[PDB]
Amino acid sequence: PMVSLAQVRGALCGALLGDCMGAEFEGSDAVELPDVLEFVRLLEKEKKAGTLFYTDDTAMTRAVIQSLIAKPDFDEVDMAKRFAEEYKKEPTRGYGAGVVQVFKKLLSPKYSDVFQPAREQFDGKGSYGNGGAMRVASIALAYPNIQDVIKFARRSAQLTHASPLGYNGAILQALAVHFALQGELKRDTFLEQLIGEMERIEKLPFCSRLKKIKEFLASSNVPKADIVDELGHGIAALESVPTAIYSFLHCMESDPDIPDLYNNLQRTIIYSISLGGDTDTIATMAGAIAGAYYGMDQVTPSWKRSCEAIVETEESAVKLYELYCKQL
Ligand SMILES: CO[C@H]1O[C@H](COP(=O)(O)OP(=O)(O)OC[C@H]2O[C@@H](n3cnc4c(N)ncnc43)[C@H](O)[C@@H]2O)[C@@H](O)[C@H]1O
Ligand SMILES: [Mg+2]
Ligand SMILES: [Mg+2]
């Protein structure tokens, strides 16, 4: 049962890789698997280290981590402060057009309720973007109890994403990492775990997305086009978090298009990015799930050395592991 440092480090490094590599194709509407496979080859031969920069996905991931270390019992005010101060420090990391206002509002003295800026988004409807899920992995790595994972995924997500679609997307991504983490579950048990939890929480949309995943996994050679059409590859959590989960699950086996000299974590990241659209966020999420599942053994030296801040990430993984051991 017990989660290893290799799993915590794997998840965080998987998350970093997915963001840094996915970022190179973000928003390019026609992205082809051939471009990704050529990208990876170039990457492996780069002489200089640290050439791939992380984006807001990692900036927000680090703020989550720093809040949990400072306030292990979960302090949404501390976390809110860290999101806003990181934005203020490095505003060009690639934040969504909507979420900038929450950070600007949190930095002002006008709000005492840290959830209120998020409540105000889109004419009071709140954001359904995937920004809550892109950064949420560390909750499942820090809190062994699945209920803490659910409630803290929601509250952390709700700092910016007040639509149920946003925060239920965050809960689902946290759950996927949570269940990926405990053992090496089989595809069917993992999905059964996920379908069961989301039924309770719903996020209805996400539940039926999980059903579509079951169907797809029961087929072979499903074209990208069917996955993009049915699961999505968009900015919305509904159109990215299930897609991240599918990429992970699919790449548990050989994909005929990806050379099988790439390991599962590499395949997952490669496959994820090939879906196009919001490539940095879908890959960071799929990479977190795969990293938690397969661990650091599949985070290869040549891949990880190419990301900005890999060392700080590895360090932060050690501190997350120590805080996971404190909760046991
Ligand atoms: C560079 O890629 C970055 O954006 C990705 C997402 O990040 P985010 O979710 O943190 O940001 P935001 O909360 O701003 O929602 C993002 C955008 O979704 C749209 N939108 C959402 N709900 C909406 C709603 N109810 N009505 C109308 N429009 C809505 C808006 O166009 C909004 O501007 C991530 O991959 C990140 O790095
Ligand atoms: Mg990004
Ligand atoms: Mg993005």
Author numbering: 8 to 209, 228 to 353
The authors write:
Poly(ADP-ribose)glycohydrolase (PARG) and (ADP-ribosyl)hydrolase 3 (ARH3) are the main hydrolases of serine PAR- and MARylation, respectively, thus playing a pivotal role in signal silencing following DNA damage. ARH3 is the only known enzyme to reverse serine MARylation and is consequently responsible for the regulation of hundreds of ADP-ribosylated proteins following DNA damage. In contrast to PARG, the active site of ARH3 contains a catalytic binuclear magnesium centre. To understand the impact of the ARH3:substrate interaction on reaction efficiency, we crystallised ARH3 in complex with the chemically synthesised substrates: histone H2B peptide (aa 1–11) MARylated on Ser7 (H2BS7mar), dimeric ADP-ribose (dimer) and α-NAD+.
Furthermore, we solved the structure of wt Latimeria chalumnae ARH3 (LchARH3) in complex with meADPr. Interestingly, while we observe an open conformation in the H2BS7mar- and α-NAD+-bound structures, both the hARH3:dimer and LchARH3:meADPr complexes adopt a closed conformation. H2BS7mar and meADPr act similarly to chelants via the 1″ and 2″ oxygens. The interactions with either H2BS7mar or meADPr increase the Thr317-MgII distance by 0.9–1.6 Å relative to the ADPr-bound state, which breaks the coordinating bond and leads to an unusual five-coordinated distorted square-pyramidal geometry around the Mg2+ ion. The importance of this step can be observed in our LchARH:meADPr structure in which the ligand engages with the magnesium centre, but fails to displace Glu33 (Glu41 in hARH3) from MgII. Therefore, meADPr can act as an inhibitor of ARH3 instead of being hydrolysed. To assess whether the 1″-O-methyl moiety of ADPra1:n had an influence on the reaction, we performed inhibitor studies utilising free meADPr. Our results indicate that the latter acts as an inhibitor of the ARH3 reaction with comparable potency to ADPr.
